[PDB]
Design a protein around this ligand. Structure first.
Ligand SMILES: *Cc1c(COP(=O)(O)O)cnc(C)c1O
Ligand SMILES: *Cc1c(COP(=O)(O)O)cnc(C)c1O
Ligand code: NA
Lengths: 395, 395
């Protein structure tokens, strides 16, 4: 007796509801901005990755307008056939210059960039050392390779060295980590990891989705912040969808790497290139961060202020260091309930559970941005005070 | 003694050059249109997926402009956190209505839509029956599941029935096929596959990247063309990047499938939603095909005109039933030589040979579009005449 479509779907949704993991996302009814509309109310938004306030900045929109009008709505092909236009190259040139790498290649997302670059680089016999809290896109990248996969305890460089001591290969050794961990907000210890990689002849792969536009001067990233951006055995991959407020992912490094990716990255070979309006906006984003580098200063001013007041109220921010400021709730239902209560106070910050974070490590991610005002952050803090007291998790 | 980054890149590029697989994409210098510029020359373009001539259409661009101005450059989040806006819902409503399915969900790409839907649906114990010529994105979707994978010979429903007789499960049986196969331009025999699925209590999964906007009334797709659009045990996945001339993929079907994907599809959970200008253009595309359904008629008129003159000259178009028009050259060298010679005549089309198709089945892939004129197709045909005569494959 084989299952029909509705019966498999129904069983899975029922399983998710019993495990307390089932979700009902909200619809935003105004632009992506530090205050927006949810369910018909003005809310302070701490749920987005809009770090630099670019998502609705008029300068990105004007550059997007220009490219849209001139080139059109769609590329109409994959990059390697008839999908590469002058505007793709212009962006790869500007991005390489910004990153201070020899080359940059843009892929259709951060999610697919991880599949493309890890797929292109890795072969049977290779050994990968993954931080246990690596983003899900990296797990999927690695599962499509025939590399041996090992996991080191989160940011635990003593444990990484033990595995480097114990697991040799004539092939590639790849140490893979988020630059900034999506849901934890802490920074990979590259100052220790990169030297450790040179000691054991390993290459380091940094997924810098939450470091790009955040860490380093003018937000050039985690690798740049630790000063390794010219190291040939360091490979950077990052989304253009967070601080840079568009879509796409990039890979940065030697021109030889770019050429291997153009030839081997499956998402690059088999998926349409990005359209004019998206590339125009990203060109605008790189121009704007050059004109207004004070946006990164402002982001970090708001962060230290907001993170300090949350700690002061008695909340566990998991040793987050970046504008990502998590509040642990443990069980997913408490995370959802806290979120619902915050929304009652006009504060939008979304409870997160398994898949996206571990079982019993459910949390609300708060992401502070350059465009938040003190008034907005104080409204959010006041709501975290009231909701925290009502739930008995603080004073 | 392990390999450094430069050494692995160098070895892979060297391998690709020796095996004749190394590629150097061309850069297009004008918009995606039936005539464009490549390498400083005007060409009749038969290399794009721009089936309805939407990629640079002023109606899609004006709708994109309107959404960009109103909503901005970026969504700034994944759909399940703070990335769903009014405009995503507007598109999923109009798309479901257009397809005549209960539900429609947009994902980051056609490529990732296959990973999301196959991942959400499939579990250990399930049995998948794949057409052997299924697109690469389906392979990657299936490799991330624990389903038992079986391959039936291309379009061979006798062979499918043998495997259906031999392999039962208490779980899901999923028959997976392209709707239109990229390489020979043939249509999945759904009129035989779907009855065969009802006989063995299987669900059918159709990747309709090359059927969406092409087959069915107003290009509602292969499944609609065979009349199975309201069947809950038929699941559609398709790119919005080809006929619809933007980016993204959709999943269309049963109302509860959407909700399972929102909760479980990894590409949906872990990749940023698409921005205003992309969604605005796709809204425009669906409105435009409603106002000008004669564009689908024109697409098919141009196809029959192009195929008729090739048959008359003595070329073999491999039984293609779609605007995808392969011209057999046999040996890969002769297919690449013909392609280069067509470009010399100002005609841009894609040579394909071994690896990508079998030994002795090399061809030039042409895609005819609604926006090609008789003048453009006559230029292409005249070049096929000259090149064919010079190579001694025709009179
Ligand atoms: C957000 C994120 C991605 C995916 O970026 P998209 O462009 O949204 O696919 C990948 N890796 C990490 C660590 C991320 O945080
Ligand atoms: C084009 C295509 C895809 C991928 O669509 P993208 O949106 O370009 O990623 C997937 N499957 C098939 C069969 C295709 O033809
Ligand atoms: Na207070």
């Amino acid at each position: 007796g084989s299952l029909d479509l509705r019966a498999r779907v129904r069983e899975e949704l029922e399983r998710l509801k019993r495990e307390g993991l089932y979700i009902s996302p909200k619809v935003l009814e105004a632009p992506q901005e530090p205050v927006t509309r949810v369910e018909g109310r003005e809310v302070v938004n701490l749920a987005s990755n809009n770090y630099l306030g670019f998502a609705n900045h008029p300068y990105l929109k004007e550059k997007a307008r220009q490219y849209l009008e001139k080139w059109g709505a769609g590329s109409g092909a994959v990059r390697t056939i008839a999908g590469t236009f002058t505007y793709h190259v212009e962006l790869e040139e500007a991005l390489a210059r910004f990153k201070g790498t020899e080359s940059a290649l843009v892929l259709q997302s951060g999610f697919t960039a991880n599949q493309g670059v890890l797929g292109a680089l890795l072969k049977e016999g290779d050994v990968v050392f993954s931080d246990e809290l690596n983003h899900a896109s990296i797990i999927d990248g690695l599962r499509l390779t025939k590399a041996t996969r090992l996991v080191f305890r989160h940011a635990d460089v003593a444990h990484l060295e033990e595995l480097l001591k114990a697991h040799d290969t004539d092939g590639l050794k790849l140490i893979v980590t988020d630059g900034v961990f999506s849901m934890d907000g802490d920074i990979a210890p590259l100052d220790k990891i990169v030297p450790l990689a040179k000691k054991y002849k390993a290459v380091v792969y940094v997924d810098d989705a939450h470091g790009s536009g955040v860490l380093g001067e003018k937000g050039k990233g985690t690798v740049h912040h630790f000063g390794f951006h010219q190291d040939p055995d360091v490979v950077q991959v990052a989304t253009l969808s967070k601080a840079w407020a568009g879509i796409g992912g990039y890979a940065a490094g030697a021109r030889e790497l770019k050429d291997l990716l153009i030839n081997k990255a499956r998402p690059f070979l088999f998926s349409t290139s990005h359209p004019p309006a998206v590339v125009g906006a990203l060109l605008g984003a790189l121009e704007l961060i050059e004109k207004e580098p004070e946006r990164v200063e402002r982001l970090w001013e708001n962060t230290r202020y907001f993170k300090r007041e949350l700690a002061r109220l008695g909340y566990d921010t998991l040793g987050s260091q970046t504008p990502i400021t998590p509040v642990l709730f443990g069980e997913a239902p408490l995370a959802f309930e806290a979120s619902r209560l915050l929304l009652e106070e006009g504060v939008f910050a979304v409870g997160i559970g398994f898949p996206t974070v571990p079982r019993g490590k459910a949390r609300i991610r708060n992401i502070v941005t350059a465009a938040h005002t003190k008034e907005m952050l104080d409204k959010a803090l006041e709501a975290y005070e009231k909701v925290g007291k009502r739930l008995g998790i603080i004073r």
